[PDB]
């Protein structure tokens, strides 16, 4: 009967990288999802299956809040059925997604003169990601057929590159903070209702 700790997810000091995206479990609390959807701080708030409008009068077992950082051009890839370096190798959503995708421009908090490079992303992977799968490995990627033997060189590249977030970039290259809410409905207590 308490209020769900969304201020931990949204108002966090630093966000996680997209390859190493974070997940917060939310249970046994009351959530007013109409504050999120009626906030003017966000650039994207898209939902799938459920309806944004006045559906904080539902119940669920667990609510999952994924959070990470990407550049503006890559926000389109956080959606069911999308392809790209992010949706294939960093964060994949299922076709039958029951949740919402929230985003907002973070050029003020994640861009630095000289460039902030702490935010990383995966550039190569042997296969695509299953929905909600996370790959935090750092294995040298084999593109050729000579064995890389855990060292980068010709046809052997380090899989993670670094976002070059400068404050003077265009909007498509500016950083965006993303929160993906996931609603779970098990034959189970259904603890997070929300009036």
């Amino acid at each position: 009967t308490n209020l769900c700790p969304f201020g931990e997810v949204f108002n966090a000091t630093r966000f996680a990288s997209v390859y190493a995206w974070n997940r917060k479990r939310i249970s046994n609390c009351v959530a007013d999802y109409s504050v999120l959807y009626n906030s003017a701080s966000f650039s994207t708030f898209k939902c799938y299956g459920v309806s944004p409008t006045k559906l904080n009068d539902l119940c669920f077992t667990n609510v999952y809040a994924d959070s990470f950082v990407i550049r503006g051009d890559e926000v389109r890839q956080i959606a069911p059925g999308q392809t790209g370096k992010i949706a294939d190798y960093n964060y994949k959503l299922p076709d039958d997604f029951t949740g919402c995708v929230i985003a907002w421009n973070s050029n003020n908090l994640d861009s630095k003169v000289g460039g902030n490079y702490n935010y990383l992303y995966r550039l190569f992977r042997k296969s695509n990601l299953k929905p909600f799968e996370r790959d935090i490995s750092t294995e040298i990627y084999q593109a050729g057929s000579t064995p890389c033997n855990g060292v980068e060189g010709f046809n052997c590249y380090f899989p993670l590159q670094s976002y070059g977030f400068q404050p003077t970039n265009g909007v498509g290259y500016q950083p965006y903070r993303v929160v993906v809410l996931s609603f779970e409905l098990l034959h189970a207590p259904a603890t997070v209702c929300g009036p």
């Binding site: 550039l123 190569f124 593109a143 046809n155 590249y157 400068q166 003077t168 970039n169 265009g170 290259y173």
Partner: protein, 707 residues
């Protein structure tokens, strides 16, 4: 497979290159908007970090065989990587070359020419000699600045340039190109399929052809200007010979724009100058660029980004910021577009603003392409897309519906001819100049012009192709071509030739899409969504396609047509012909302004030809010129009681033949303009003709003077 290897290789290169140049572009923008010494360092560091990475990625891309790759867009990306910017040279011959390039730039930037009667008033090129050659109607003054800028600075470049083509060839041959010219012409070498590919030698053949189709319109403009310049230089221009190379409105004759006050068809009617209306209406920098932004968006293009407005430099600043501000359009990268320009409220800077934003519009369209394909189709597309916008905006129609022209303003045909000519002196006068220059360099890089023929062949093509003659003869101590910024700074020059053809191809095409009826020079693309969509479709492909196709889906022709240019100038072409009915059309290759005062000498063939014991060389020519100077020295002292210290530097040899014949005239010691009249030089020779035949062992039928 070897395509995946290169697909993932480019994936990583893109991820690193994008930010490696952006930090480099930022570092050079910090400098150009605040000149300091910290910013020169922060620039050079990021530039080195970028160059080193580009070398690394050009080597690592070299071992990616192009033969076995069945995709075209990834083919072109590797091509750029392998072709450009490799090492093929030793560390010593590369260091040696870098020193030569900096020396040539420094000498050109810092050189100066002093005055004949005040050697402490030495004058740089900018802005001292620029202002003289562009505004002076004094023959002798321009001759001093012209010749002075070729003897004090050009001669310094001849040894450096000789070494510069050698190291460029030696480098270009290592890239598996024929010459350094071959390496330059690679930019036009496409791959096409569904068709035949454009080759590097096809550019030379198309460029020769286009000149021959321009020759008619040029010959008439060259003839009309010659007849007009005769009014202000009555006794210096022959009505049938070539044009003195120092009277063309600047140092080299690259443009004839500064000849308009002397060649204006109808002076009583001024040309349209909007500047006063802009001022009285209170226009500022912002109003100019917003009106350019309004123009582009009126053509269904995108408006600028608030990153462009909040970060570009539209005006010269406050608090003593030294800024190189000569208009440029920066695509820094990462969607960061800016314009650096010290704009003023004038009409000139009003057109230039539309030209710069024209570059930004091109930059925004192909931003969706991979880093290596974010560029114009060929080296002539950018500066042509820039100038086509300037064409349609400078029209009286556009200014009329802007509030800068009275609705009661009339457009009569007398001013149209004034405008057409003001354009032709700039657009058409430069085309023969631009064509013979690149031809000369192509011929020098190929080796078809020995170093002992450089200036001989350089001016033969000047009198033949451009129809301009040097005011004083230059031997191989000069490097007159290197007197131009582009030649002494290792930049291509055909890009100004091709851009002019592509410009009017684009113009004639878009004015047909915009259903424009009437003469072509009165066209205007504003408020035409049809014409803007087809334009953005060409700007968006960037460099990812054959420029033949990219040009084919705008103007409906795979090839380079100068037709639209001549079609644009037909009103002036038919007016020039009627205005040339009473004067000569063409030029006389052999005439020169020093010719009639020269004296023809005939070297004795003491044995038939090629017996090289005798048959005089450069050193005998010095002895001959010093012997002439003595005769001139002796003459004036013994006949006029004057101490005039002639020298070998005051005896000018022209019409040189291979140890067979030549001409020569004499000038006052510290004044190149005043030539000693020929009858006096003939007398000075007679007085000492026995003294000149002795030194060369000739006997007055061997050494003859034709008069």
């Amino acid at each position: 497979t070897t395509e995946d290897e290169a697909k993932k290789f480019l994936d990583k290169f893109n991820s690193k290159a994008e930010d490696l140049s952006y930090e480099s572009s930022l570092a050079s923008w910090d400098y150009n908007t605040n000149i300091s010494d910290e910013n020169v360092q922060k620039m050079d560091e990021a530039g080195a970090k970028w160059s080193a990475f580009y070398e690394e990625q050009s080597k690592l891309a070299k071992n990616y065989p192009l033969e076995e790759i069945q995709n075209d867009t990834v083919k072109r990306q590797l091509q750029i990587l392998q072709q450009s910017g490799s090492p093929v040279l030793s560390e010593d011959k590369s260091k040696r070359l870098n020193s030569i390039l900096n020396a040539m730039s420094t000498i050109y930037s810092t050189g100066k020419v002093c005055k004949p009667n005040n050697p402490q008033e030495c004058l740089l090129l900018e802005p001292g000699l620029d202002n003289i050659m562009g505004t002076s109607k004094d023959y002798n003054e321009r001759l001093w600045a012209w010749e002075g800028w070729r003897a004090e600075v050009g001669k310094q470049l001849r040894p450096l340039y000789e070494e510069y083509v050698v190291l460029k060839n030696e480098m270009a041959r290592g890239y598996h190109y024929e010459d350094y010219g071959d390496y330059w012409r690679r930019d036009y070498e496409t791959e096409e399929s569904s068709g035949p590919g454009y080759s590097r030698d096809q550019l030379m053949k198309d460029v020769d052809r286009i000149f021959t189709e321009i020759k008619p319109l040029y010959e008439h403009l060259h003839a009309y200007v010659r007849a007009k310049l005769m009014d202000t230089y009555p006794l210096h221009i022959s009505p049938t010979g070539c044009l003195p190379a120092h009277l063309l409105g600047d140092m080299w004759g690259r443009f004839w724009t500064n000849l308009y006050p002397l060649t204006v068809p109808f002076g009583q009617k001024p040309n349209i100058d909007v500047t006063d209306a802009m001022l009285n209406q209170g226009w500022d920098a912002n109003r100019i660029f917003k009106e350019a932004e309004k123009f582009f968006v009126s053509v269904s293009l995108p408006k600028m980004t608030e990153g462009f407005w909040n970060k570009s430099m539209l005006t010269e600043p406050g608090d003593g910021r030294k800024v190189v501000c000569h208009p440029t359009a920066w695509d820094l990268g990462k969607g960061d577009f800016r314009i650096k320009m010290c704009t003023k409220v004038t009409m000139e800077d009003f057109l230039t603003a539309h030209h710069e934003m024209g570059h930004i519009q091109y930059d925004m369209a192909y931003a969706s392409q991979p880093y290596l394909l974010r560029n114009g189709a060929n080296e002539g597309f950018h500066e042509a897309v820039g100038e086509v916008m300037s064409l349609s905006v400078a029209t009286p129609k556009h200014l009329k519906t802007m509030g800068l022209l009275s609705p009661d303003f009339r457009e009569d045909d007398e001013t149209e001819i004034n405008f057409l000519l003001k354009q032709a002196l700039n657009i058409v006068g430069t085309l023969p100049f631009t064509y013979m220059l690149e031809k000369w360099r192509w011929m020098v890089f190929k080796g078809e012009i020995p170093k002992e023929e450089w200036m001989k062949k350089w001016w033969e093509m000047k009198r033949e192709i451009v129809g301009v003659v040097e005011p004083v003869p230059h031997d191989e101590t000069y490097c007159d071509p290197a007197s131009l910024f582009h030649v002494a700074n290792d930049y291509s020059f055909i890009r100004y030739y091709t851009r002019t053809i592509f410009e009017f191809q684009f113009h004639e095409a878009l004015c047909r899409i915009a259903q424009h009826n009437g003469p072509l020079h009165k066209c205007d693309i504003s408020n035409s969504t049809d014409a803007g969509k087809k334009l953005h479709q060409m700007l968006s492909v960037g460099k990812s396609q054959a420029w033949t196709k990219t040009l084919e889906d705008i103007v409906d022709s795979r090839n380079m047509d100068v037709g639209p240019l001549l079609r644009y100038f037909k009103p002036l072409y038919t007016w020039l012909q009627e205005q040339n009915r009473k004067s000569y059309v063409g030029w006389n290759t052999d005439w020169s302004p020093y010719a009639d005062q020269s004296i023809k000498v005939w070297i004795s063939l003491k044995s038939a030809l090629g017996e090289k014991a005798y048959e005089w060389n450069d050193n005998e020519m010095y002895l001959f010129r010093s012997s002439v100077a003595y005769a001139m020295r002796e003459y004036f002292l013994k006949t006029k009681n004057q101490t005039i210290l002639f020298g070998d530097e005051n005896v000018w040899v022209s019409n040189l033949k291979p140890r067979i014949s030549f001409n020569f005239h004499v000038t006052s010691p510290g004044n190149v303009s005043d030539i000693i009249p020929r009858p006096e030089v003939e007398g000075a020779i007679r007085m000492s003709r026995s003294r000149i035949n002795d030194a060369f062992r000739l006997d007055d039928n061997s050494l003859e003077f034709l008069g």
